[PDB]
């Protein structure tokens, strides 16, 4: 299958640089135009940049707001698309997507988060939301005080997925973010089944496995 595996995004200061990468497979990469699209809550979906084929002498096009600061390029021999990003501004913050382009954005990569901020990274504290004692009981984990997004929560190393609800993060009065993940389970099993939430904050390389107990 078509795979567009992106990397290279993250926290960066205003004025800074990031180089995005997109590794392609499952289709003849050199036969297709490629483009980058970004997404921010405030401006929605915004086409960024485009590169055409060898047979078009690698013509490129850019959105007006990135011209001169961004550079898209391709290495067909590595099946990789690039986006070099300089003089980053806060308005560049968003999710950046890698796209094959064939009259339309026909396949999209998973997306890499670019945050343009002068704040420092901060790993999270994980605290149990411990149940008390009626057929179904709820237990959870509080991921608190991290920067930047995102964190990931799984339960019992991905085994437990039934009834889990990971809530969207909230920006607090402090620049840090707080997240809650909860699971509903038969209160009978609370003595016969262990429950552990697995918290991953890639931006700070933090992995935390927290046992939740009544």
């Amino acid at each position: 299958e078509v795979q567009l595996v992106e990397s290279g995004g993250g926290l960066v200061q205003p004025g800074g640089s990031l180089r995005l990468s997109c590794a392609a497979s499952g289709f003849t990469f050199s036969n297709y135009w490629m483009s980058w699209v970004r997404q921010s809550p405030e401006k929605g979906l915004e086409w960024v940049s485009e590169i055409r084929l060898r047979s078009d002498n690698y013509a490129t096009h850019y959105a007006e707001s990135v011209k001169g600061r961004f550079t898209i390029s391709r290495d067909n021999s590595k099946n990789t698309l690039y986006l070099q990003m300089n003089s980053l501004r806060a308005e560049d913050t968003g999710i950046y997507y890698c796209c094959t382009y064939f009259y339309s954005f026909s396949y999209w990569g998973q997306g890499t988060l670019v945050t343009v901020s002068s704040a420092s990274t901060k790993g999270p504290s994980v605290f149990p939301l411990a149940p008390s004692s009626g057929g179904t009981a709820a237990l959870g984990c509080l991921v608190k005080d991290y920067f930047p997004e995102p964190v990931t929560v799984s339960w019992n190393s991905g085994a437990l997925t039934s009834g889990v609800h990971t809530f969207p993060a909230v920006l607090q009065s402090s620049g840090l973010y707080s997240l809650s993940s909860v699971v509903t389970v038969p209160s009978s099993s609370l003595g016969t089944q262990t429950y552990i939430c697995n918290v991953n904050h890639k931006p700070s390389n933090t992995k935390v496995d927290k046992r939740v107990e009544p």
Partner: protein, 216 residues
């Protein structure tokens, strides 16, 4: 540039209903070559957008028959013959006719289902959090519809204003409900000086507000 405009901004319809989304182009998309290059995209929550319709009326590979595209000139429409719980997603119309490529603002499609009342859980601050010097109290509302709910924090029956944050999932892809997490944030000194803590939940599924509390 070709400004793309979508309407309505959100809609809510029950399973099996027919939904029509309208996309308006600022200037007429060229139809001289053939079908104009108008594309429809579906974005599920926390997921990359996927091409649903291309060239006004062509279904992309694997896209179900219920999704259909139509339109001409400055007006194009997206229609789903029967709404499905899986179907709800933000829906986007984009033009490939001229640079810069432009997108509509999206149309949020939500499934309308029956009322379902939430299960409310309260959770006291952990001792480890108290050692840090802050107290976080969380109230969980689980599997409810409609989205609109009023959570209120009371500490010794004192209404609390401006020291709590809430967060809501998107609709479950299968049963179409929402869950809500509200977090009451207090300093440890403000936690120890009081005893009763409660969230009061008011929702259509409850004939009367349901409060869950603890003492500490």
């Amino acid at each position: 540039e070709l400004q793309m405009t979508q309407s309505p901004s959100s809609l809510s319809a029950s399973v099996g209903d027919r939904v029509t989304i309208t996309c308006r182009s600022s200037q007429s998309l060229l139809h001289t070559y053939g079908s104009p290059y108008l594309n429809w995209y579906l974005q599920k929550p926390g997921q990359s957008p996927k091409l649903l319709i291309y060239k006004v009326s062509n279904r992309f590979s694997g896209v179900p028959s219920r999704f259909s595209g139509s339109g001409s000139g400055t007006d194009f429409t997206l229609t789903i013959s029967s709404l499905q719980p899986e179907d709800f997603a933000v829906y986007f119309c984009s033009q490939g006719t001229h640079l810069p490529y432009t997108f509509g603002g999206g149309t949020k499609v939500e499934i309308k289902r029956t009322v379902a009342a939430p299960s409310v859980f309260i959770f006291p601050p952990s001792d480890e959090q108290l050692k840090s010097g802050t107290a976080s109290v969380v109230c969980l509302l689980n599997n409810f519809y409609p989205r609109e709910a009023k959570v209120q924090w009371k500490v010794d029956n004192a209404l609390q204003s401006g020291n709590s944050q809430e967060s809501v999932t998107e609709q479950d892809s299968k049963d179409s409900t929402y869950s809500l997490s509200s977090t009451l944030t207090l300093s440890k000194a403000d936690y120890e000086k009081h005893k009763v803590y409660a969230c009061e939940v008011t929702h259509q599924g409850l004939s009367s507000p349901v409060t869950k509390s603890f003492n500490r």
